[PDB]
């Protein structure tokens, strides 16, 4: 019996601010105990100030991102180049994921952007389609090493609402450095995309594997 699935590791993290969103991921693609690539981005700018990242089976994530981008292009064609909201994108991704209910994608999905009011918004998707809006979400085989760090160094009830973008970037960098120290899979780089009303900004940091 041919096995159509696989695993490529990787860790992603999405945080929602008061007027911005952050989506970061480690840029290392690895097979079982071997490094395929030391720089392979997993977070993409999927159109109208929306960042998307599917972690797990790389081929499934690439296919899902490609399908979503084509759907966004046809959405712009159909409705006078109307801007696609984050909740509509979330429902589109839910339908895309559930369309393969009996042959599921082996990915966990996180998207980030700004809602209608202007606050940061992060949506999390299980492989079959179920989604919900969260303030912070960590996916991959480092979440148990990243979430307690964030809970210790910040409160979601220093409240998260008063944080600036630089403080969030610093917290993400520190958590990923700690995970890199503790976890073998995590390392070799960290790419962060910040979504604000001005657009999407990209930053890169080198982790402890070169």
């Amino acid at each position: 019996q041919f096995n159509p699935y696989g695993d490529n590791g990787g860790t992603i993290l999405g945080i929602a601010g008061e007027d911005f969103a952050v989506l970061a991921g480690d840029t290392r693609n690895i097979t079982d105990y071997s490094i395929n690539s030391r720089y392979e981005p997993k977070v993409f700018d999927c159109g109208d100030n929306i960042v998307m990242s599917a972690n797990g089976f790389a081929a499934d994530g690439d296919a899902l991102v490609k399908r979503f981008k084509n759907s966004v292009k046809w959405y712009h064609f159909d409705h006078n180049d109307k801007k696609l909201s984050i909740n509509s994108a979330a429902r589109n991704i839910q339908h895309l994921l559930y369309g393969k209910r009996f042959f599921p994608y082996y990915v966990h999905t996180i998207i980030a952007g700004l809602d209608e009011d202007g606050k940061g918004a992060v949506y999390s998707f299980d492989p079959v389609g179920s989604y919900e809006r969260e303030q912070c979400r960590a996916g991959g085989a480092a979440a148990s090493l990243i979430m307690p760090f964030l809970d210790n160094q910040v409160n979601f009830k220093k409240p998260l609402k008063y944080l600036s973008v630089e403080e969030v970037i610093k917290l993400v960098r520190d958590s990923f450095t700690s995970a890199t120290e503790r976890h073998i899979q995590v390392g070799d780089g960290l790419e962060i995309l910040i979504v604000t009303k001005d657009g999407v900004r990209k930053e890169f940091y080198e982790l402890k594997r070169d």
Binding site: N36, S37, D62
Partner: protein
């Protein structure tokens, strides 16, 4: 299919300051039997693309047929096929990755590992890897099979990161590739002594070398 029957072993590729270099040995093994000698596993597509395929030989020939069909259809009906309307390596890799993923989703995959190497029109090097599951990735050095475990560290010692690409001349990359092929012939049972090499350079074009043999063998440390 369910498993390869006649199989190739490894393809190794590296980036240097002006282009890319790829190499693969000429052998088709029938299980533990080294059956066919003289199997070309590097396919030159266009004047600037080289595709290296490792794995099932029948699927490799099928992919060769697909590449030839693509090249023939490109000239239909472009009168500038040799001109700026040629096939970029990105187009070929996108088509091949789409085919591999579609066949994987159909439960009838092509048991191959494919490395596409070349130089774009603007002069940017292109080097990508795809497999039977449709997993695609890029790196300054790429390899398949036992090359991914033995030749990869040797190549990464030369081109460690993206900043080291402009510092690597073609001579250094070619020497490293030859040494990696020698190591593979040393420590791979299904490997072969004869191999082919391809250099794609934005100035000198495509250089294809055949009937290259592993030399400088060290066996005297026995008795």
């Amino acid at each position: 299919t369910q498993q390869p029957i006649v199989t190739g072993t490894s393809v190794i590729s590296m980036k240097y300051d002006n282009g890319v270099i790829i190499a693969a040995d000429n052998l088709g093994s029938y299980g533990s039997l080294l059956r066919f000698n003289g199997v070309e596993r590097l396919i030159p597509v266009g004047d600037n693309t080289v595709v290296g395929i490792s794995g099932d030989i029948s699927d490799m020939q099928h992919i060769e047929r697909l590449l030839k069909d693509l090249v023939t259809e490109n000239a239909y009906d472009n009168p500038l096929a040799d001109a700026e309307e040629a096939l970029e390596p990105s187009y070929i890799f996108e088509y091949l990755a789409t085919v591999m993923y579609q066949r994987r989703s159909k439960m009838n995959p092509l048991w191959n590992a494919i490395i596409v190497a070349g130089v774009q029109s603007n002069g940017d090097q292109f080097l990508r890897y795809v497999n039977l599951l449709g997993v695609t990735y890029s790196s300054p050095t790429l390899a398949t099979g036992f090359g991914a475990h033995m030749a990869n560290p040797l190549l990464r010692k030369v081109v460690d990161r993206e900043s080291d690409i402009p510092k690597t001349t073609v001579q250094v990359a070619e020497e490293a590739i030859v040494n990696a092929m020698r190591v593979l012939y040393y420590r791979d049972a299904r490997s072969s002594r004869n191999f082919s090499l391809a250099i794609i350079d934005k100035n000198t074009g495509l250089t294809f070398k055949k009937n290259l043999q592993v030399e400088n063998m060290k066996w005297d440390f026995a008795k």
